[PDB]
Design a binder for this molecule. Structure first.
Ligand SMILES: O=P(O)(OC[C@@H](O)CO)OC[C@@H](O)CO
Length: 311
């Protein structure tokens, strides 16, 4: 048995997302004795964002690695999973992805032709990156902030008080340099990995408005033709790779902040409650969502927090 798969994502070689995909692909190749050959293609040189997910839906020999908002048009519950200001830590989100609730969402994705291998390639809390000290939604008035091109991001930055400007990453950094947008948003790992800090935007507001994470998607039609012994290896290696990425970035974050600070980046806290109030209206069911999905998510998060507090 032989299968070759093209894996596409938008990240740069210096970023851990890219390094993790390479490591997992190599591990799977080795552990399957060459039977499963996943080749990686960084920096959106192949179809990416929704175009990558489209290849998956259309049954290509393809793995798309994108945040869950990019499967939300096909499986609307994933819009709720990627809602803003839900998660307080990487661990909360990992825990939620292991819940029966999220397993049910994965089953919904399979019915739409999308096999989800992971949801928790976490690349960090996304923060505002601008030339200003932003503390409240009022501070964002008139500021054009680049976001990725999905409704989740557009709605989030709009509700936060900005002029959301949805653009692929490739159209972003020069746009920031030229003032076509006033800033952007992303994790400290994105900031350092793509050298956002070498540009004019060296103020980071710790809004943590979205927990940036990639899922890993493959067509059910392709998946179902893979012998079970190789399915298990592919699945185990993607799960292990996510765990490693999450633990690594958790470890690195303090150092990354210090290194960014050494390059002149200045971090500030925000009025969290003010941003939470601005965003609360976004927790509304959209067509195709499971009735009560937000309430179900909140119930899980509340329970894990309650148990943590107790112990
Ligand atoms: O802000 P984006 O377009 O986030 C997209 C990511 O969520 C994948 O779907 O890119 C993040 C960077 O780290 C890419 O180099």
């Amino acid at each position: 048995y032989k299968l070759t798969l093209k894996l596409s994502h938008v990240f740069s070689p210096a970023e851990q997302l890219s390094k993790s995909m390479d490591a997992v692909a190599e591990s799977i190749y080795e552990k399957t004795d060459g039977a499963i050959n996943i080749q990686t293609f960084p920096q959106a040189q192949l179809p990416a964002y929704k175009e990558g997910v489209e290849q998956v839906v259309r049954g290509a020999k393809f793995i798309s690695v994108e945040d869950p908002s990019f499967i939300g048009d096909y499986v609307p519950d994933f819009k709720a999973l990627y809602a803003p200001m839900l998660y307080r830590s990487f661990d909360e989100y990992v825990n939620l992805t292991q819940s029966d609730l999220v397993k049910k969402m994965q089953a919904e994705a399979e019915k739409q032709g999308i096999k989800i291998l992971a949801l928790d390639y976490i690349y960090g809390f996304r923060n505002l990156i601008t030339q200003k000290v932003i503390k409240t939604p009022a501070d964002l008035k008139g500021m054009k902030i680049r976001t990725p091109g999905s409704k989740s991001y557009i709605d989030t930055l709009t509700a936060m008080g900005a002029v959301a400007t949805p653009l692929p990453w490739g159209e972003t950094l020069s746009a920031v340099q030229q003032g076509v947008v006033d800033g952007l948003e992303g994790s400290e790992f994105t900031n350092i990995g793509t050298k956002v800090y070498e540009g004019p935007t060296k103020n980071v507001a710790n809004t943590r408005h979205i927990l940036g994470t990639c899922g890993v998607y493959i067509s059910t039609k392709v998946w179902n033709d893979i012998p079970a012994k190789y399915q298990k290896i592919i699945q185990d290696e993607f799960t292990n790779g996510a765990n490693h990425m999450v633990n690594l970035l958790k470890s690195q974050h303090g150092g990354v902040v210090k290194e960014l600070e050494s390059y002149g980046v200045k971090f500030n806290e925000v009025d969290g409650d003010a941003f939470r109030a601005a965003l609360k209206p976004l927790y509304k069911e959209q067509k195709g969502m499971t009735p009560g999905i937000y309430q179900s998510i909140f119930k899980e998060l509340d329970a894990m927090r309650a148990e943590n507090l107790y112990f």
